[PDB]
Structure formats: C-alpha cells, structure tokens
C-alpha cells in the first residue's frame, strides 16, 4: 500500500550522461552508441539568444570545438551534424554503458522521468508529464539543458525528452531525441507564452482508482454520469475532454476495483463542483494528473 | 526555476540490489562488499508472523538455505548472522559495484530516497521523509521488503533505511542498516499503531523559501512573530515545535531571499489560520514538509 510519485530507476540513463562544452557554454549531452546528442543552442553565446541563425553559427564550428567529457575522460569528436534543434556529435568510442534504447515522441498527458544533470553529472530524478500545452513543469537551472526524459520497459530505455529551455513563466520546453520541440516552442529568447494548462482528465481518474486501491474512498459517491455530461463539467473546469479511448484504457482499473469508469467520472464531477472541503486524497489536497493509467497499474502491481 | 520532489540518482544503489530467498519467502537484499543485508523476517513463514522467535527460527537455517541472486547469477553464502532485525549474509564475492558508503541513522524530519525493489529488481525511486512518529509514507507491496532508503553526498551513499513492514493504517516501518527499527515498531504482525503524524515545521519553512525563490510569493505578508508565539500556533495545528537550531539551519535561505526566518514563520502562521483559499504554492494545495532546508539549497543551487 501507499502511492507515491515515482520515477524510473535512473542508472541506465546516468551511464549515458556526458558534458558538452562549445566555447564558453557548457550543458549536458546524451551518449548512446558513438553519438552524443545535445541541444544545438550549445553553440550560441547568451549575447545572440534573441535571433540565432543556427546554420550560420554552426559553419564557424569544427569537431575540435565541441568538448565532450564522460566522467573525467575526454571523448574524441569525429563528426557533427544538426538534426532539427539537436546536435549529434559522432565520437570515436561507443558508450560501453549504452542500454537498449528507443527514441519516442510522446503525446500530451504522457508521463516520464527526468534525470536532471549539471556538467554531465546527475543531480536528481523526478517524474513529469507532457502538459496539454506541450510544456513540462520541471526543475531546471542554467546548465541543466540536455538533461533527458525517459520511460523504461524492463531493460529498454525510451528517450522522449531533452531539455532546452525555460519560458518567462518558469515552465519548460524541449524536444524529442530527433530535435523536434514539443509544441510551438523555439530555441530563441523571444515572447513564447504557453497556452492553457488544462488538467489531464484520464490521469486524474487513474489516480482516483489508485486512491480507492489504497484505501482512500471518501470521495466515492452514489452517482453516475455520461461521457457527454461529464465533458460539459470537464470543459467548465479546464479539464481535457474524456474520450471512449480513455474509458477503454481505464478498463483494467475499473475491473480491479469494480467501479465503472462513468461512476468514477461522477465522483470526479462532484469533486470539481464541491471541492475537497479540506480533505485529502493520497496525501494531496488537489486532483493529481501526472499518473497515467499505465503508471497506476505498474505501481499498484510492482512491475520491475 | 521550478521545484520538484526530487530523489537522488539511483544507479549506485541499483548496483547493490540482490534477491534473497529463504524457503518460500523472497525479498530484497543490499549487497555491499562481501555482505548482503536483508530483513530477518525472510526466515519466517506468514503462518508464524504473530509471534516469531527469530533466534529459534534461525537455528534451523544454514548458509545453503539463503539463496542470494545478483541479476541472474547465484552468490555463494559462506556465513550468516543476525544483527538486531537484519541478517548479514557473508558471500564469497565482494560486490564489484560497491559504491563508497556509510550506514547512518537519521532523525525524524530527515528526507531520503527509496529505491523500491521486487525480486532484487528496481521498480522505481521516490523521495520520503522519516515522519515525527517514525513511520514513512512509502509505496511498498509484498516483496518490497529489503528495499533501502539513502542519501548521496557526491559519490558516498549514506544508507539510512531498510523496509521491513506495513502497519494496518498503510504506513511503513523499517530499520537503519544496523537493524534497529525507527520508532517503537517490531517485525511482528501485532497491534502497532503509529503516534501523531505531526508536520515537520522546519521543512515547511524551507519549502516556503523555495516557493519565494521560484516566484510563488502571494503568501508573503506584512507580519512577523516570535518563536514562542509561532509555537503556540504550531502546537494547535500539530506542527513540530520550531527551535533556534531550526532557525539557524534556515539562515542561508533567509540570507538568499532577504526574508527573516520569523517573518516567514508569520506567513506560515497566517497560512495555518486562514488556509490556502483555493490557491496553490509550488503546485501544491497543502503545505509540503518533505523538503529539508538542505534539499532546498541543493535543488535551488544544482548540487551534483
Ligand atoms: C536558464 C535556464 C534555466 C532552465 N532551463 C533552461 C534554461 N536556459 C535557457 O532557456 C536557454 N536560454 C538562456 S535562451 O535565452 O533560451 C538561449 C537561446 C538560444 C541560444 C542560447 C545560447 C546560450 C544560452 N541561452 C541561449
Ligand atoms: C505486505 C507488505 C507490504 C508492504 N510492506 C511490507 C509488507 N510486509 C510486511 O509487513 C511483512 N508481514 C507480512 S508481517 O506479517 O509483518 C511478518 C512478520 C514477521 C514474519 C513474517 C514472515 C513472512 C511474512 N510476513 C512476516
């Protein structure tokens, strides 16, 4: 029993973190096979952050200008290329600690773990979700760029995020490992305001199922609703619309608890309309939305 | 910017997790040097959980009865002994991945990371605090016993907790790595009710400092208080008494933000008396107490 915001074990990813320096800028790189992936803004000075022409800036850079250090040993850069907003630095040595891996682009509502790093060194690990406005609410300081987000399926690490920037509102933006930003964000210091940060309805329902499994049942009511009725309330509260795909995905949780998905929707509807009344659910006074139905099943079953 | 509940990178601890089986019971062990540490209840059957005589039960066990598996390879047990509530299984091979380590016994209010494991395999990592009633609010299922809590200081892992049990209220109890339980708990299935789970006042204040550093300032008021006045309110709300030692420990946060500790106490006092009014602090609708002043400085400065 107990339900915690849990990150994947980070060891497999720690074995991939390296430091990349270009001129005066130092950030993190991800070393998989003989390639080091890092944000392309490593080539920029803070003076040219307003409107960088990455292609032009890259022309002035050679392999020897990218300093890659894995622990206290230097890696030899034998090639460099830009793919969207990431640089791929080909090194002469394959990372001996390269785990089985995939590059995936996640959808909003999907959760992942972040290994926050500075100077190629891991500082901590936390669990995130890709927000519906394509930002992440992380914990990143200057030097953390190049830190990655990932999920693990037994021994295969699926890398889904690379940290690139902080927006003026303190929220974060980044790319997948092909260098494509999530959302409309760009690696420029310019007016980039995030859209509505709506609540991930399917994740809240999964977390309400976790609460029932762990003994927190006070919010369960005598009501039911329909997808259409629920969604009228969800729109009113800036919650994402719930679809039949979401209902189906909650099927195993519904089956384990014996609580129909639409009955849990009615419980959630009453929580939205009435509030918590000073009560808590799984030690929280707000409805948590950074647990997917897959995370709930995984944590409640002990998947290793 | 951003402030997250962050665990230490778990790699150094993943390299220590092993599976220990004695008869029909399987749990986790911690392999450091040529010793495997695990809860002594691995020798018990669920049938004798009410009143186990560990010394007598251990007499019927020999080295070959403890099956220790590190990955998919078996370790040879050449000795076994009981130290308080842990078994120390001497193996013939020193763990080649043994990090620099210490065994520490923490005080209530101190935080640590837990690497939840099943069958010697890591499933996830989360951050905990030793509660003032000596329980932890973890996430542990059957098979998770022997999972450890730790802190990391650069390259030295300080092991502070080993999971042993779940109380009927769904809270957790365990020992330090010398096998001494935190609090009055025993490794028996008996009436063991936890005391008052008071709030760790010094940690809440540290977290209010983190909120100010990260832009959440709405709760700052025009008031101050004294330690004695604050403590009258703290007792009323089941908050731990704040001492001059706590005030001193918050000195660096006070210095960085320019907000006197007693002024932050008055802000906290008003939050206790008035509530949040539907507002949030660092994405939370309740006052978080599982960040120490050291965790706040570490996360806000990027210690690796
Ligand atoms: C500070 C911080 C905190 C947390 N997470 C990410 C960051 N960094 C950033 O957001 C990066 N910026 C300072 S930036 O202005 O977006 C930028 C754009 C383009 C080229 C650049 C070259 C060098 C430095 N910056 C550049
Ligand atoms: C189930 C669970 C979930 C989360 N975290 C810890 C647990 N286990 C427990 O609490 C362990 N118990 C089932 S127990 O009753 O306290 C116990 C005491 C003594 C000897 C025993 C031998 C074998 C199994 N149990 C024994």
XYZ file of C-alpha atoms and ligand atoms in Angstrom:
660
model
C 0.000 0.000 0.000
C 0.860 3.692 -0.323
C 1.043 5.578 -3.600
C 3.965 7.806 -4.479
C 5.043 9.978 -7.409
C 7.639 7.518 -8.611
C 10.371 7.893 -11.198
C 12.054 5.003 -13.034
C 15.417 3.841 -11.643
C 17.908 6.227 -13.334
C 21.075 4.115 -13.518
C 20.739 3.179 -17.188
C 20.470 6.908 -18.063
C 23.238 8.037 -15.636
C 25.605 5.815 -17.672
C 24.795 7.965 -20.735
C 25.283 11.498 -19.379
C 28.227 13.499 -20.631
C 29.307 17.154 -20.518
C 29.389 19.133 -23.774
C 31.182 22.476 -23.988
C 31.329 24.721 -27.016
C 33.247 27.907 -26.310
C 32.015 29.333 -23.014
C 28.713 27.358 -22.853
C 28.522 24.037 -21.010
C 25.490 21.771 -20.986
C 24.633 18.050 -20.923
C 24.801 15.519 -23.695
C 23.319 12.042 -24.093
C 25.883 9.442 -25.230
C 24.318 6.417 -26.990
C 26.500 4.214 -29.195
C 29.126 6.537 -30.831
C 26.786 9.576 -30.882
C 26.383 12.369 -28.311
C 23.038 14.224 -28.547
C 22.739 17.732 -27.172
C 20.748 20.969 -27.659
C 22.030 22.965 -30.611
C 21.942 26.182 -28.522
C 25.286 24.951 -27.005
C 26.912 26.805 -29.984
C 25.325 30.161 -29.020
C 26.556 32.903 -26.764
C 23.916 34.469 -24.429
C 24.517 37.679 -26.497
C 22.962 36.061 -29.609
C 19.971 34.398 -27.868
C 17.350 36.792 -29.384
C 17.646 35.669 -33.029
C 20.246 32.918 -33.603
C 20.875 31.592 -37.130
C 21.954 28.112 -36.131
C 23.120 27.114 -39.616
C 25.383 30.166 -39.851
C 26.651 29.763 -36.278
C 27.444 26.101 -36.941
C 29.621 26.970 -40.012
C 32.152 28.581 -37.619
C 32.362 25.329 -35.563
C 34.624 22.340 -36.203
C 34.716 18.875 -34.477
C 37.532 20.060 -32.132
C 35.375 22.969 -30.863
C 32.919 20.507 -29.193
C 34.490 19.342 -25.941
C 32.824 16.104 -24.751
C 33.766 14.718 -21.363
C 32.420 11.423 -19.932
C 33.354 11.410 -16.265
C 36.904 12.724 -16.210
C 37.867 11.378 -19.677
C 37.640 13.308 -22.933
C 35.892 11.836 -25.963
C 37.238 12.455 -29.466
C 34.653 14.152 -31.765
C 34.965 12.798 -35.344
C 31.827 14.362 -36.838
C 28.999 16.765 -36.110
C 25.609 17.436 -37.604
C 22.432 19.258 -36.783
C 19.097 17.442 -36.814
C 16.292 19.941 -36.156
C 17.201 21.535 -32.710
C 19.738 18.900 -31.597
C 23.383 18.369 -32.445
C 24.629 14.850 -32.972
C 28.336 14.652 -32.163
C 29.878 11.493 -33.553
C 32.603 10.265 -31.211
C 35.257 7.597 -31.880
C 34.135 5.424 -28.933
C 30.784 3.705 -28.491
C 29.426 4.232 -24.960
C 30.156 0.904 -23.235
C 27.163 1.540 -20.940
C 24.666 2.112 -23.821
C 21.443 0.431 -22.728
C 18.806 -0.957 -25.120
C 17.065 2.191 -26.277
C 14.427 3.800 -28.473
C 13.632 7.413 -29.376
C 9.946 8.080 -28.940
C 7.833 11.212 -29.290
C 5.203 11.237 -26.566
C 1.704 12.721 -26.578
C 0.412 15.257 -24.024
C -0.731 13.543 -20.827
C 2.125 11.016 -21.021
C 4.438 10.859 -18.074
C 8.184 10.319 -17.929
C 11.176 10.561 -15.613
C 13.781 13.335 -15.868
C 17.381 12.868 -14.804
C 18.341 16.478 -14.023
C 22.047 16.955 -14.748
C 24.697 19.685 -14.491
C 28.151 19.441 -16.169
C 27.285 15.888 -17.294
C 26.624 14.883 -13.665
C 23.272 13.678 -12.351
C 21.768 15.720 -9.548
C 18.328 14.158 -9.187
C 15.417 12.294 -10.675
C 11.778 13.289 -10.766
C 8.597 12.334 -12.557
C 6.987 14.728 -15.131
C 4.094 14.768 -17.588
C 3.967 16.355 -21.042
C 1.304 19.036 -20.367
C -1.626 19.505 -22.823
C 0.022 22.877 -23.790
C 3.334 20.967 -24.568
C 5.292 22.418 -21.682
C 6.674 20.425 -18.725
C 6.717 21.637 -15.127
C 10.272 20.607 -14.303
C 13.072 21.707 -12.021
C 15.861 23.057 -14.186
C 18.551 25.661 -13.637
C 21.161 27.104 -16.057
C 23.438 24.231 -17.086
C 20.598 21.635 -16.976
C 19.973 21.787 -20.767
C 20.498 18.436 -22.425
C 19.020 16.604 -19.354
C 16.657 13.914 -20.685
C 13.185 12.490 -20.024
C 12.632 8.774 -20.429
C 10.499 5.731 -19.703
C 11.839 2.181 -19.121
C 10.171 -1.037 -20.331
C 12.122 -3.768 -18.412
C 15.602 -3.134 -19.964
C 14.791 -0.783 -22.882
C 15.012 2.948 -22.247
C 12.629 5.025 -24.404
C 14.032 8.550 -24.520
C 11.250 11.039 -25.086
C 12.520 14.463 -23.999
C 15.652 16.603 -24.000
C 15.570 19.849 -22.007
C 16.184 23.021 -23.999
C 14.550 25.999 -22.355
C 12.686 27.864 -19.719
C 9.833 30.169 -20.696
C 9.368 33.501 -18.776
C 6.549 31.878 -16.737
C 9.006 29.325 -15.252
C 7.678 26.379 -17.290
C 9.886 24.254 -19.524
C 10.142 23.428 -23.207
C 12.190 20.844 -25.014
C 12.439 18.411 -27.852
C 12.183 14.683 -28.572
C 15.576 12.980 -29.420
C 15.094 13.833 -33.127
C 15.338 17.538 -32.095
C 11.713 18.473 -32.738
C 10.228 20.654 -29.993
C 7.104 19.576 -28.272
C 4.561 22.258 -29.034
C 5.192 25.527 -30.825
C 8.314 26.481 -28.900
C 11.574 27.595 -30.467
C 15.135 27.713 -29.119
C 15.193 31.532 -29.115
C 14.754 34.023 -26.287
C 11.537 35.598 -27.514
C 7.854 36.065 -26.495
C 6.749 32.458 -26.134
C 3.655 32.219 -23.991
C 2.216 28.807 -23.171
C -1.434 28.020 -23.867
C -3.994 26.791 -21.318
C -2.562 24.230 -18.987
C -5.606 22.004 -18.806
C -5.867 19.031 -16.415
C -5.225 15.530 -17.846
C -8.639 14.017 -17.054
C -7.733 10.369 -17.814
C -4.744 10.639 -15.437
C -6.853 12.097 -12.615
C -9.302 9.173 -13.000
C -6.401 6.697 -12.916
C -5.160 8.404 -9.723
C -8.698 8.217 -8.197
C -8.569 4.446 -8.948
C -5.142 4.284 -7.189
C -6.709 6.077 -4.205
C -9.532 3.509 -3.961
C -6.997 0.602 -4.255
C -5.012 2.202 -1.394
C -7.956 2.842 0.959
C -8.849 6.479 0.208
C -12.543 6.042 -0.592
C -14.353 9.046 0.984
C -14.932 10.724 -2.419
C -16.861 7.738 -3.874
C -20.493 8.729 -4.316
C -23.891 7.271 -5.210
C -23.848 8.866 -8.690
C -23.038 8.119 -12.291
C -22.827 10.324 -15.398
C -22.382 10.007 -19.197
C -19.295 10.962 -21.247
C -21.225 13.963 -22.654
C -22.470 15.186 -19.232
C -19.034 14.681 -17.670
C -17.339 16.562 -20.553
C -19.605 19.612 -20.065
C -18.241 19.806 -16.468
C -14.689 18.986 -17.638
C -14.758 21.867 -20.199
C -16.019 24.231 -17.450
C -13.056 23.294 -15.208
C -10.348 23.336 -17.938
C -10.073 19.541 -17.893
C -9.230 17.696 -21.101
C -12.246 16.061 -22.809
C -12.574 12.379 -21.882
C -12.908 10.049 -24.887
C -14.034 6.410 -25.292
C -10.306 5.609 -25.827
C -9.642 6.971 -22.306
C -12.572 4.927 -20.885
C -11.183 1.775 -22.533
C -7.666 2.482 -21.235
C -9.141 2.698 -17.676
C -10.834 -0.736 -18.209
C -8.256 -2.738 -16.166
C -8.545 -0.303 -13.221
C -12.332 -0.419 -13.436
C -12.135 -4.260 -13.459
C -9.759 -4.491 -10.492
C -11.817 -2.095 -8.320
C -15.313 -2.986 -9.551
C -16.031 0.751 -10.048
C -17.400 1.574 -13.514
C -15.414 4.330 -15.277
C -18.515 6.546 -15.593
C -19.229 6.157 -11.844
C -15.647 7.358 -11.138
C -16.339 10.252 -13.587
C -19.367 11.219 -11.454
C -17.165 11.139 -8.324
C -14.664 13.402 -10.124
C -17.539 15.688 -11.289
C -18.654 16.131 -7.657
C -15.048 16.797 -6.565
C -14.844 19.528 -9.229
C -18.179 21.115 -8.265
C -17.881 20.782 -4.453
C -14.128 20.886 -3.898
C -12.146 18.830 -1.373
C -13.685 20.562 1.727
C -10.262 20.485 3.424
C -9.872 16.738 2.879
C -7.038 14.958 1.057
C -6.719 12.073 -1.452
C -3.426 10.114 -1.386
C -1.860 12.911 0.729
C -2.868 15.553 -1.838
C -5.305 18.482 -1.498
C -5.636 18.783 -5.301
C -6.523 16.290 -8.034
C -3.217 14.802 -9.284
C -2.899 14.386 -13.060
C 0.703 13.210 -13.543
C -0.040 9.466 -13.192
C -1.200 7.676 -16.338
C -3.455 4.583 -16.114
C -0.286 2.595 -17.047
C 1.684 4.167 -14.134
C -1.148 3.304 -11.721
C -1.218 -0.380 -12.795
C 2.603 -0.550 -12.793
C 2.949 0.902 -9.286
C -0.018 -0.998 -7.871
C 1.337 -4.334 -9.304
C 5.097 -3.854 -8.706
C 6.442 -4.008 -12.289
C 10.266 -4.125 -12.296
C 13.258 27.591 -11.945
C 10.604 25.062 -10.927
C 10.715 22.986 -7.763
C 10.108 19.256 -7.782
C 10.056 16.420 -5.250
C 13.390 15.035 -6.347
C 15.105 11.778 -5.483
C 18.857 11.144 -5.754
C 20.049 9.352 -8.911
C 19.594 5.646 -8.010
C 22.295 3.954 -10.100
C 24.788 3.492 -7.266
C 22.068 1.701 -5.232
C 20.694 -0.332 -8.200
C 24.181 -1.905 -8.433
C 23.696 -3.217 -4.868
C 20.244 -4.827 -5.075
C 20.015 -8.589 -4.876
C 17.237 -11.143 -4.331
C 17.233 -13.172 -1.105
C 15.069 -16.275 -0.746
C 14.750 -18.409 2.348
C 12.295 -21.247 1.850
C 9.154 -19.837 0.249
C 9.803 -16.142 1.117
C 11.583 -13.852 -1.342
C 12.613 -10.287 -0.590
C 15.419 -7.830 -1.409
C 18.923 -7.680 -0.060
C 21.585 -4.967 -0.119
C 24.994 -6.240 -1.298
C 27.932 -4.105 -0.070
C 31.436 -5.588 -0.069
C 31.043 -9.360 0.701
C 27.920 -8.856 2.869
C 24.235 -8.999 1.883
C 21.906 -7.175 4.319
C 18.248 -8.119 4.477
C 15.273 -8.135 6.890
C 15.432 -11.066 9.283
C 11.721 -11.819 8.667
C 12.902 -13.523 5.395
C 13.287 -16.680 7.596
C 9.607 -16.621 8.674
C 6.566 -18.190 7.119
C 3.398 -15.991 7.035
C 1.934 -18.641 9.438
C 4.381 -17.601 12.204
C 4.077 -13.801 11.740
C 2.132 -13.235 15.027
C 4.939 -14.125 17.468
C 8.205 -15.176 15.768
C 11.212 -16.209 17.885
C 13.887 -15.162 15.431
C 16.750 -16.776 17.355
C 14.965 -20.138 17.405
C 13.881 -19.854 13.760
C 17.448 -19.019 12.733
C 18.842 -22.202 14.420
C 17.022 -24.275 11.751
C 18.750 -22.279 8.944
C 22.152 -22.963 7.389
C 24.186 -20.875 4.838
C 22.819 -23.001 1.931
C 19.202 -22.165 2.901
C 19.739 -18.460 1.974
C 19.524 -18.175 -1.803
C 21.155 -14.913 -2.980
C 20.884 -13.962 -6.628
C 22.530 -10.861 -8.175
C 20.986 -10.453 -11.605
C 20.845 -13.977 -12.982
C 23.931 -15.256 -11.084
C 23.883 -17.008 -7.722
C 26.116 -15.850 -4.880
C 27.702 -18.371 -2.514
C 26.729 -17.760 1.165
C 29.699 -18.534 3.471
C 28.287 -17.149 6.730
C 25.171 -15.697 8.305
C 24.427 -13.689 11.402
C 21.649 -11.650 12.889
C 22.253 -8.063 13.980
C 19.097 -6.698 15.632
C 16.329 -7.086 12.906
C 18.648 -7.600 9.911
C 20.502 -10.634 8.627
C 24.008 -10.195 7.312
C 24.785 -12.905 4.765
C 28.501 -13.155 4.116
C 29.103 -14.084 0.484
C 32.363 -15.249 -1.138
C 32.395 -12.370 -3.663
C 32.680 -8.663 -2.916
C 30.130 -6.657 -4.933
C 32.226 -5.160 -7.753
C 29.750 -2.251 -7.928
C 30.017 -1.377 -4.182
C 29.984 2.414 -4.013
C 31.589 4.471 -1.222
C 29.086 4.075 1.581
C 28.120 4.802 5.174
C 25.366 3.491 7.453
C 23.592 6.363 9.133
C 20.602 6.540 11.462
C 18.517 9.571 10.565
C 16.341 11.766 12.778
C 12.634 12.472 12.162
C 12.158 15.235 9.591
C 15.121 13.990 7.530
C 14.428 13.097 3.955
C 15.826 10.301 1.815
C 15.302 8.459 -1.457
C 13.849 4.938 -1.649
C 14.694 2.524 -4.435
C 11.591 0.304 -4.385
C 12.568 -3.210 -5.477
C 10.912 -6.584 -6.119
C 12.886 -9.860 -6.545
C 16.138 -7.853 -6.345
C 14.996 -5.679 -9.274
C 14.425 -1.931 -9.068
C 10.945 -0.742 -9.939
C 11.115 2.940 -9.032
C 12.593 5.733 -6.989
C 10.822 8.246 -4.800
C 11.624 10.743 -2.087
C 10.478 10.136 1.555
C 10.866 11.719 4.983
C 11.227 9.981 8.347
C 7.953 11.149 9.973
C 7.977 12.564 13.556
C 6.121 9.327 14.603
C 8.987 7.232 12.987
C 6.900 5.864 10.151
C 7.463 6.596 6.440
C 4.699 7.149 3.896
C 6.114 4.957 1.145
C 4.844 2.864 -1.730
C 5.562 -0.759 -0.924
C 3.876 -4.014 -1.863
C 4.594 -7.615 -0.732
C 8.096 -8.488 -1.944
C 9.408 -4.902 -1.461
C 10.983 -5.670 1.961
C 14.711 -5.076 1.971
C 14.304 -2.023 -0.369
C 16.536 0.753 1.013
C 16.435 4.493 1.736
C 19.552 6.546 1.147
C 21.124 9.954 0.639
C 24.133 10.685 -1.629
C 26.931 13.170 -0.857
C 28.771 13.442 -4.246
C 29.966 9.778 -4.506
C 29.243 8.421 -0.993
C 25.910 6.708 -0.422
C 24.609 7.020 3.163
C 22.140 4.186 3.692
C 19.603 5.144 6.320
C 16.587 2.853 5.910
C 15.677 -0.727 5.050
C 11.991 -1.531 4.517
C 10.524 -4.149 6.840
C 6.807 -3.659 7.271
C 3.456 -2.142 6.656
C 1.255 -1.172 9.592
C -2.570 -1.721 9.335
C -3.007 2.012 8.559
C -0.961 1.646 5.328
C 2.114 3.460 6.688
C 5.576 1.909 6.725
C 8.145 0.904 9.312
C 11.730 -0.165 8.936
C 15.207 -0.148 10.330
C 18.571 1.565 9.845
C 21.323 -0.715 8.310
C 22.317 -1.901 11.819
C 18.816 -3.494 12.050
C 17.371 -1.142 14.658
C 13.808 -0.051 13.870
C 12.995 3.580 13.675
C 10.462 4.190 16.405
C 8.819 1.576 18.588
C 7.935 -0.829 15.796
C 8.680 -4.539 15.810
C 8.891 -7.103 13.000
C 5.752 -8.925 14.191
C 2.179 -8.815 12.917
C 0.605 -7.283 16.002
C -1.291 -4.133 17.145
C 1.207 -1.430 16.244
C -0.500 1.921 15.962
C 1.519 4.958 14.917
C 1.515 8.115 17.030
C 0.571 11.614 15.840
C 1.926 12.369 12.429
C 2.842 15.974 13.071
C 4.045 18.337 10.316
C 7.818 18.976 10.035
C 7.743 22.751 10.596
C 11.377 23.456 9.596
C 10.798 21.623 6.285
C 7.624 23.589 5.511
C 9.559 26.848 6.095
C 12.355 25.630 3.803
C 9.709 24.834 1.154
C 8.142 28.330 1.607
C 11.661 29.736 0.944
C 11.863 27.545 -2.222
C 8.483 28.960 -3.288
C 9.710 32.563 -2.914
C 12.948 31.726 -4.858
C 10.758 30.259 -7.639
C 8.263 33.146 -7.884
C 5.387 31.952 -5.671
C 5.133 34.949 -3.340
C 1.380 35.551 -2.760
C 1.516 34.161 0.814
C 4.173 36.675 1.987
C 2.579 39.072 4.455
C 3.295 42.269 6.388
C 3.709 40.378 9.692
C 6.324 38.904 11.965
C 6.095 36.711 15.079
C 8.353 35.275 17.830
C 9.421 31.627 18.270
C 7.110 31.375 21.320
C 4.071 32.929 19.559
C 4.656 30.827 16.438
C 4.990 27.631 18.535
C 1.611 28.240 20.235
C 0.049 28.175 16.714
C 2.274 25.249 15.645
C 1.141 23.147 18.673
C -2.513 23.970 17.829
C -2.035 22.677 14.252
C 0.018 19.548 15.138
C 3.204 21.100 13.751
C 6.542 20.234 15.338
C 7.909 22.937 17.685
C 10.402 25.216 15.918
C 13.718 25.613 17.768
C 16.614 28.104 17.487
C 18.559 25.227 15.822
C 15.877 25.173 13.083
C 16.063 28.997 12.726
C 19.858 28.788 12.365
C 19.595 25.970 9.805
C 17.256 28.227 7.724
C 19.893 31.050 7.892
C 21.241 30.506 4.327
C 17.698 30.556 2.868
C 16.865 33.667 4.873
C 20.101 35.282 3.565
C 19.477 34.378 -0.081
C 15.864 35.659 -0.054
C 16.251 38.565 2.382
C 13.215 37.261 4.334
C 13.872 36.900 8.076
C 13.010 33.415 9.404
C 10.489 34.845 11.899
C 8.764 36.815 9.096
C 8.403 33.525 7.141
C 7.034 31.967 10.389
C 4.355 34.700 10.468
C 3.478 33.921 6.824
C 3.181 30.229 7.770
C 1.083 31.168 10.862
C -1.380 33.044 8.618
C -1.483 30.107 6.168
C -2.367 27.816 9.095
C -5.064 30.141 10.470
C -6.590 31.270 7.133
C -5.923 28.300 4.866
C -4.931 28.428 1.188
C -8.312 29.885 -0.005
C -8.150 27.639 -3.092
C -4.681 28.884 -4.042
C -1.537 26.788 -4.538
C 2.170 27.063 -3.590
C 4.656 25.276 -5.896
C 1.730 23.360 -7.484
C 0.541 22.143 -4.065
C -2.712 22.902 -2.200
C -1.173 21.818 1.135
C 1.991 22.834 2.985
C 4.741 20.396 1.888
C 7.035 19.119 4.651
C 9.229 16.538 2.887
C 11.944 19.003 1.772
C 14.657 19.786 4.316
C 16.484 23.156 4.258
C 19.452 21.166 2.812
C 17.255 19.741 -0.013
C 16.002 23.252 -0.842
C 19.555 24.679 -1.119
C 20.739 21.604 -3.061
C 17.903 21.765 -5.603
C 17.962 25.551 -5.891
C 21.794 25.524 -6.468
C 22.131 22.389 -8.654
C 24.395 20.203 -6.470
C 25.540 17.098 -8.389
C 18.379 29.419 -17.825
C 17.615 28.128 -17.977
C 17.002 27.532 -16.878
C 16.288 26.362 -17.045
N 16.142 25.747 -18.224
C 16.730 26.308 -19.286
C 17.475 27.486 -19.221
N 18.103 28.029 -20.366
C 17.503 28.558 -21.455
O 16.288 28.707 -21.573
C 18.468 28.988 -22.545
N 18.483 30.445 -22.770
C 19.283 31.269 -21.857
S 17.945 31.133 -24.143
O 17.982 32.546 -23.930
O 16.707 30.497 -24.468
C 19.096 30.760 -25.449
C 18.566 30.630 -26.704
C 19.392 30.454 -27.798
C 20.743 30.383 -27.646
C 21.333 30.465 -26.362
C 22.711 30.274 -26.109
C 23.183 30.288 -24.831
C 22.292 30.498 -23.795
N 20.992 30.686 -23.956
C 20.503 30.665 -25.232
C 2.794 -6.959 2.812
C 3.726 -5.777 2.898
C 3.508 -4.642 2.122
C 4.362 -3.563 2.235
N 5.411 -3.533 3.063
C 5.633 -4.619 3.811
C 4.831 -5.761 3.768
N 5.121 -6.899 4.558
C 5.057 -6.998 5.904
O 4.660 -6.101 6.647
C 5.504 -8.343 6.446
N 4.416 -9.105 7.087
C 3.504 -9.856 6.218
S 4.379 -9.419 8.684
O 3.117 -10.039 8.945
O 4.726 -8.206 9.354
C 5.647 -10.614 9.052
C 6.228 -10.518 10.287
C 7.140 -11.469 10.707
C 7.492 -12.502 9.895
C 6.952 -12.616 8.592
C 7.362 -13.584 7.646
C 6.849 -13.571 6.384
C 5.920 -12.602 6.053
N 5.489 -11.668 6.885
C 6.002 -11.662 8.152
